[PDB]
Amino acid sequence: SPIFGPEEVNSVEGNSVSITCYYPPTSVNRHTRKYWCRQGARGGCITLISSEGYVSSKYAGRANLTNFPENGTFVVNIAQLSQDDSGRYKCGLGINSRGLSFDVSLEVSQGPGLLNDTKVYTVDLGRTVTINCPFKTENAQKRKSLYKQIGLYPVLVIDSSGYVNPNYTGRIRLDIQGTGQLLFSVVINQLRLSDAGQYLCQAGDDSNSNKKNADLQVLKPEPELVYEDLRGSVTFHCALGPEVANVAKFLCRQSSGENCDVVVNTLGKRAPAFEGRILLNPQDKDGSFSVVITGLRKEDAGRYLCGAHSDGQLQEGSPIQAWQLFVNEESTIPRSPTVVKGVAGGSVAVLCPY
Amino acid sequence: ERIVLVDNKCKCARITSRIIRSSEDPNEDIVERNIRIIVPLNNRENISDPTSPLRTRFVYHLSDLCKKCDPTEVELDNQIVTATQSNICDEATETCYTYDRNKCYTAVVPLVYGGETKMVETALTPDACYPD
Amino acid sequence: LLPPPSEELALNELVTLTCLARGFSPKDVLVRWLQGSQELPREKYLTWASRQEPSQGTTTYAVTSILRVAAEDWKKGETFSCMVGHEALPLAFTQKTIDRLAGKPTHINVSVVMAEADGTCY
Amino acid sequence: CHPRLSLHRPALEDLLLGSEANLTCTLTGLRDASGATFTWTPSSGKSAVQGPPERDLCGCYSVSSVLPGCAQPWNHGETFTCTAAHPELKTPLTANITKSGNTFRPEVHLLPPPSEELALNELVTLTCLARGFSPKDVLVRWLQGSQELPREKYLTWASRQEPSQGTTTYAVTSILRVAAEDWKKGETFSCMVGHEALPLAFTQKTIDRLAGKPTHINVSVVMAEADGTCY
Amino acid sequence: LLPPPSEELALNELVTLTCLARGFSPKDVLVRWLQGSQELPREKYLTWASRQEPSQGTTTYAVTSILRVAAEDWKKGETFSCMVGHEALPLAFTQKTIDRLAGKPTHINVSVVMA
Amino acid sequence: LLPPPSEELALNELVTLTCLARGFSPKDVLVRWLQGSQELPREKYLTWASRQEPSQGTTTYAVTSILRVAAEDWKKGETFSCMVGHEALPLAFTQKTIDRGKPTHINVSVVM
Ligand SMILES: *[C@@H]1O[C@H](CO)[C@@H](O[C@@H]2O[C@H](CO)[C@@H](O[C@@H]3O[C@H](CO)[C@@H](O)[C@H](O)[C@@H]3O)[C@H](O)[C@H]2NC(C)=O)[C@H](O)[C@H]1NC(C)=O
Ligand SMILES: *[C@@H]1O[C@H](CO)[C@@H](O[C@@H]2O[C@H](CO)[C@@H](O)[C@H](O)[C@H]2NC(C)=O)[C@H](O)[C@H]1NC(C)=O
Numbered sequence A: 001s002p003i004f005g006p007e008e009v010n011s012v013e014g015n016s017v018s019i020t021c022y023y024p025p026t027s028v029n030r031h032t033r034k035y036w037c038r039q040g041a042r043g044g045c046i047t048l049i050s051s052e053g054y055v056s057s058k059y060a061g062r063a064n065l066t067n068f069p070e071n072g073t074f075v076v077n078i079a080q081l082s083q084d085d086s087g088r089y090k091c092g093l094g095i096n097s098r099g100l101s102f103d104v105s106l107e108v109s110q111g112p113g114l115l116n117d118t119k120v121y122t123v124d125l126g127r128t129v130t131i132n133c134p135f136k137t138e139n140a141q142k143r144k145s146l147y148k149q150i151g152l153y154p155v156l157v158i159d160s161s162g163y164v165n166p167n168y169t170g171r172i173r174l175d176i177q178g179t180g181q182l183l184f185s186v187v188i189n190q191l192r193l194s195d196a197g198q199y200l201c202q203a204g205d206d207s208n209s210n211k212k213n214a215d216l217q218v219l220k221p222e223p224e225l226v227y228e229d230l231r232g233s234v235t236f237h238c239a240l241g242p243e244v245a246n247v248a249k250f251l252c253r254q255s256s257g258e259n260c261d262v263v264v265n266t267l268g269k270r271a272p273a274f275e276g277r278i279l280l281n282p283q284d285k286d287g288s289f290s291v292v293i294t295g296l297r298k299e300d301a302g303r304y305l306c307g308a309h310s311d312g313q314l315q316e317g318s319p320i321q322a323w324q325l326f327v328n329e330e331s332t333i334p335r336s337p338t339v340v341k342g343v344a345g346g347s348v349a350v351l352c353p354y
Numbered sequence B: 001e002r003i004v005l006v007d008n009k010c011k012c013a014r015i016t017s018r019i020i021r022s023s024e025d026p027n028e029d030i031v032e033r034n035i036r037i038i039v040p041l042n043n044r045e046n047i048s049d050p051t052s053p054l055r056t057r058f059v060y061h062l063s064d065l066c067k068k069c070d071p072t073e074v075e076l077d078n079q080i081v082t083a084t085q086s087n088i089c090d091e092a093t094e095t096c097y098t099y100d101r102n103k104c105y106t107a108v109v110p111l112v113y114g115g116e117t118k119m120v121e122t123a124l125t126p127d128a129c130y131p132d
Numbered sequence C: 001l002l003p004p005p006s007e008e009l010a011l012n013e014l015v016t017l018t019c020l021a022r023g024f025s026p027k028d029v030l031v032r033w034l035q036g037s038q039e040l041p042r043e044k045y046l047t048w049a050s051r052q053e054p055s056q057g058t059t060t061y062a063v064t065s066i067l068r069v070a071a072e073d074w075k076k077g078e079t080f081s082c083m084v085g086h087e088a089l090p091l092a093f094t095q096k097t098i099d100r101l102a103g104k105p106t107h108i109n110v111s112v113v114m115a116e117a118d119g120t121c122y
Numbered sequence D: 001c002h003p004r005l006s007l008h009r010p011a012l013e014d015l016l017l018g019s020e021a022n023l024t025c026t027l028t029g030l031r032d033a034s035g036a037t038f039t040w041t042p043s044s045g046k047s048a049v050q051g052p053p054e055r056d057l058c059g060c061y062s063v064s065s066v067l068p069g070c071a072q073p074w075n076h077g078e079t080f081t082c083t084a085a086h087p088e089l090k091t092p093l094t095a096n097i098t099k100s101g102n103t104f105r106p107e108v109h110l111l112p113p114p115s116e117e118l119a120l121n122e123l124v125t126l127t128c129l130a131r132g133f134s135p136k137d138v139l140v141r142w143l144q145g146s147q148e149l150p151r152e153k154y155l156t157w158a159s160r161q162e163p164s165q166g167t168t169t170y171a172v173t174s175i176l177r178v179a180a181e182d183w184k185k186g187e188t189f190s191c192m193v194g195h196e197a198l199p200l201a202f203t204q205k206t207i208d209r210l211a212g213k214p215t216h217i218n219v220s221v222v223m224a225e226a227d228g229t230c231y
Numbered sequence E: 001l002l003p004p005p006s007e008e009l010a011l012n013e014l015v016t017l018t019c020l021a022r023g024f025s026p027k028d029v030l031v032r033w034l035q036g037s038q039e040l041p042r043e044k045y046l047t048w049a050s051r052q053e054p055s056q057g058t059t060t061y062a063v064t065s066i067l068r069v070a071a072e073d074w075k076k077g078e079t080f081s082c083m084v085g086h087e088a089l090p091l092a093f094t095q096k097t098i099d100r101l102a103g104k105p106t107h108i109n110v111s112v113v114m115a
Numbered sequence F: 001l002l003p004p005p006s007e008e009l010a011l012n013e014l015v016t017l018t019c020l021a022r023g024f025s026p027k028d029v030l031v032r033w034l035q036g037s038q039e040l041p042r043e044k045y046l047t048w049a050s051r052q053e054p055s056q057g058t059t060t061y062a063v064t065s066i067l068r069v070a071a072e073d074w075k076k077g078e079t080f081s082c083m084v085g086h087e088a089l090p091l092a093f094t095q096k097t098i099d100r101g102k103p104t105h106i107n108v109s110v111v112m
């Protein structure tokens, strides 16, 4: 229960991985036994590598485990991954049949093989990308269509003369450096999650319906793990690029039914539940700022998103960052009075612990 | 299984409770109480080594598990007063059935070193007894 | 402190909490009430006087007090306290705190687990 | 034959159960003798006495010298260096030693007697195993009740290296033979293991007749007032 | 042949078995392990030397050996053996076998009193 | 090694133990019996010869033997064993013992 780590972990074959688990730094917890075990079916929760010197037969040459007592963390490295290593695992301390653990899910996907006739582009959610398409020396006076196989329909919703979709409106252009040579290009601003898939580009047509592919991958951001305790404080560092340094930035908290709730804005908003215990700082030359929240309660734990928009709300097509927070609650911070009363003309005296 | 009342680690007993707003008769509802006892099958009676054989009898008094005797702070008028919280805590002295992960338990054994003897100290739970 | 009777909870209007303090040799006592951690004002409850009880050898006294609260927020989960002060107590005060979850249950679940493994109680 | 020089750590029983802790620096393979001398980098009292030489394989000189009072620098993690010059070689030799790092602590196990020894009613045997510790120095002592037994009543083997599942570790065993009437009265016996990596330098396990091949499990749980206004 | 200790099965790593031979007068002896019917290679276990044990009647000797096997094979119900060869045995060998049962207790009595 | 049918265990006179071998390629065995750690002389038991079993494809064999022993020490708990010698075994012998296969009794009582 006080143990925390990355909930889901993805990779491909041949690659490595690095998993970190967190624990309270009390002296029993630093000297006790640490373990990594594979919670299979049929009862047991068989250990794969441990802290005392046990390495299993399947993990020989591939893995190790290092304990850092001053962080209160311990790391597990696993090299040369396969597809039989997909399953549910556990960090832990002590004896397996107790419950001082944390569940981790690991999925390994099959890589690329013998289909490499495309030029892929990867891009962050809410950024720009280009799709180059070599124009040739006869196919100018046709249509420069661009399908996207919704099912197996050729869905032309982009043409290079303005015949566009009301879906993809307001952000698509072309710029001319062609007229005889072998390139033109289209810049796509403010990509969404909806705009993935395979693109069958063309530039004119010589009638064999000859095909060119140029596919893209749009990825949602990886949350950073923060480990704090009761009655403490946290800082986030929101470090988007200098391209949006004149936009109003914000910070929500993810809820169950896909609902950010605004904690702070740059145009002057606040929740009532954070009155008295939140700060927001002026941004630097890089357009990077920090948000401080003190007096951490139990219900503050969850996913947080910082972004940017013209109004200060989570809208689609906006660049985001992420975090995941854990409030420990087996804290060592001493309790204190929260309210101190006084009368007019009198004194007060408050005790402040470090 | 919702709210913890007692979490005792000298006897290793835990009591929770929950208002189950049941489906049928929707203007009345039950109060459930869960108790969990974990019984060690290899501990001694006193926690030293040669005491007496392994404990075979385990007794739990819920009037003692729910007891509360540490002083508290109460704001009455515009004041802070200190009060007690129980009628029966005329007095450690309780017997423990299990160990506790956050406390040392040591012993003393005399061994010989050629001439005299010593008073060598021995850790009974080695994880919790590092000097740190 | 005594919980409300069972047949006041059906009406869902107001419920009664009784406080009984017994067996003190001087005839002086204090009784206050708290909700959560907020003291209620003195015009919200009724306190009787201190009288002497039938003699089991030596002369001791008794006193009572009642308080009526809303039936809805007793079920929501608020807590109430009866605080009694007398000059023979060591810390001069004592307190009892009651609520709905710390009461006589309807269902009881007991599970006894036998642990050959260890005797540490994590 | 040609000489050699080595360095030896202090013995375990003097660092745990004792006060003094003498290092030693020896010199073997010397032909006849020398008027040699040594060198120790901390020398705040370094009365490095030599004593007499010994006689070795086929005829050799072997002299040595110890350094007293080095317990707390050894436990703090310091370093010691020895270096000697003598007639019968060209250049002085050198050596160094330090307290070990990346150690492990033992897992101690005490086993009940076998089932077929209890029938013949003459003597029984108890086994003490220690496993998985990183330096190879260890001690084993037995008790009866709460009194130590003399050293000449049991048998302890040496520490050896076990097959590898990762890091290299060691193991040791011991047995003790006791009268079969004391096992049935209800006497208790205990095994003690001392190691460099344990917290208070010793740990122990205990066993008697009711704990181990029990053939009977009796347990009675009493719960007094389950419906009782828990505040 | 001794069953594994109860403190060890709760870690799910490996369980250890212990073989002991005691009371033989000439100090030469062999120790081999098996799994079912297959003899295991020598690099899988550890035996000690053959020391002399402290008695007063005559001179006898003793030796030990350990084998650490996987917990999943101990749970599945496989059997392991210890063979010992000596001059004085009439058939030159003797064998002991063990599995996950037969260290389990004979009967258990639990009584709960709700009063 | 098979334990001793309860039909003659009820009578408490003697019991029969059966050693069975099965599945070996040449028709050559050696069967001996022991008790505790002492070997019994060869006139206390009988042993049949090696017949060929019919089974799937290849040809293997089988032997049996029978020992009778007093029920007094068997009730007390004295143990017995059967040895089998063959040249396809790596250490030339195997051995199976038996002793008075019972399961665990469990008594749980609740008192109100
Ligand atoms: C349970 O066992 C513990 C451990 O044996 C008992 O505590 C120990 O009791 C002995 C005898 O009363 C104490 O020994 C005394 O030592 C002082 C010197 O410090 C000496 O003046 C006395 O003459 C006597 O030798 C010992 O200090 C004490 N505490 C320890 C070891 O921490 C305990 O009493 C037992 N409890 C029950 C309920 O059985
Ligand atoms: C606490 O965790 C940090 C990780 O943020 C550790 O920092 C890394 O430590 C390794 C040493 O194993 C170095 O190789 C890296 O360069 C360090 N930095 C990063 C960014 O990875 C740090 O070592 C841990 N604390 C202690 C005391 O070791």
Ligand SMILES: *[C@@H]1O[C@H](CO)[C@@H](O)[C@H](O)[C@H]1NC(C)=O
Residues within 6 Å of the ligand: A061, A062, A063, A064, A077, A078, A079
């Ligand atoms: C072992 O740990 C080190 C950390 O010092 C790491 O660099 C290395 O990759 C690990 N070895 C593996 C995973 O085989």
Ligand SMILES: *[C@@H]1O[C@H](CO)[C@@H](O)[C@H](O)[C@H]1NC(C)=O
Residues within 6 Å of the ligand: D079, D095, D096
């Ligand atoms: C100790 O001696 C070794 C030679 O075996 C040498 O490589 C090492 O550097 C020496 N260390 C110190 C601290 O002198």
